[PDB]
A paper describes a structure:
[name] ([name]), also known as [name] ([name]), is a well-characterized ARE-binding factor that destabilizes [name], while human (Hu) antigen proteins of the ELAV (embryonic lethal, abnormal vision) family are known to stabilize [name]. [name] has four isoforms, p37, p40, p42, and p45, generated by alternative splicing. [name] contains two tandem RRMs and an adjacent Q-rich motif. Many proteins regulate [name] stability by interacting with the AU-rich elements (AREs) in the 3′-untranslated regions (3′-UTRs) of mRNAs.
We obtained the [name]-p37RRMs protein by RNase treatment and determined the high resolution crystal structure of [name]-RRM1. A selected [name]-p37RRMs crystal was diffracted to a resolution of 1.7 Å and belonged to space group P212121. Consequently, we produced selenomethionine-substituted crystals using similar conditions and experimental SAD phasing succeeded using the AutoSol pipeline in the Phenix program. However, after refinement we realized that the two models of RRMs were identical because they had the same sequences as RRM1. The monomeric RRM1 molecule shows a typical RRM structure that contains αβ sandwich with a βαββαβ topology. The PISA analysis, based on the calculated interface area of 374.2 Å2 for the two RRM1 molecules, indicates that the arrangement of RRM1 dimer is most likely generated by crystallographic packing. The two RRM1 molecules are easily superimposed with a root-mean-square deviation (RMSD) of 1.80 Å for 79  Cα, except for the loops β2β3 (L1) and α2β4 (L2). Taken together, these results suggest that the linker between the RRM1 and RRM2 [name]-p372RRMs proteins was cleaved by a certain protease, possibly a serine protease, and the free RRM1 fragment was specifically crystallized 1 or 2 days later. Although we only obtained the [name]-RRM1 structure, it is still possible to compare the structure with other tandem RRM structures such as HuR and hnRNP A1, because two molecules of [name]-RRM1 are found in the asymmetric unit.
Residue numbers in the entry:
A (entry chain B): 76 to 157
B (entry chain A): 76 to 154
The structure:
């Protein structure tokens, strides 16, 4: 089954391509997004990743250190969202 | 803050103590229960867990899968 993640802490200069390239380290990424302010475009500071295989989510969680564009980021399982 | 969870999908043989023992690995459990039908007293096949610290709920939700008595169970935030 596909596996979905919420990604917090994304730097303001992070692009969708940045996000896709990074999480491709863990397997095939079906899609990924930044969440944008619909009015200003200010990076809300988080994004989402949709993996082809949910085992990829396990591999992300297994790895302790995630950094992207010089900022520590925080991948979470979708089910963990409040 | 405390953290309250709904625990779905419990096996018929799961006890209150099973719940306490299993979820205690994520942090202190204040209490936990097997829910019963308020009229018939019949098992509802799910339970509740009250963690002393809400952090424990986050730890539970970081885990790939939860298995108890051979069965995959389904912890949810109580809301």
């Amino acid at each position: 089954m596909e596996g979905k993640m919420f990604i917090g802490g994304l730097s303001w200069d992070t692009t969708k391509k940045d996000l896709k390239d990074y999480f491709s380290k863990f397997g095939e990424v079906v899609d990924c997004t930044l969440k944008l302010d619909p009015i200003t475009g200010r990076s809300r500071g988080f994004g989402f990743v949709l993996f082809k295989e949910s085992e990829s989510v396990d591999k992300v969680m297994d790895q302790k250190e995630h950094k992207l564009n010089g900022k520590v980021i925080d991948p979470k399982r979708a089910k963990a969202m409040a």
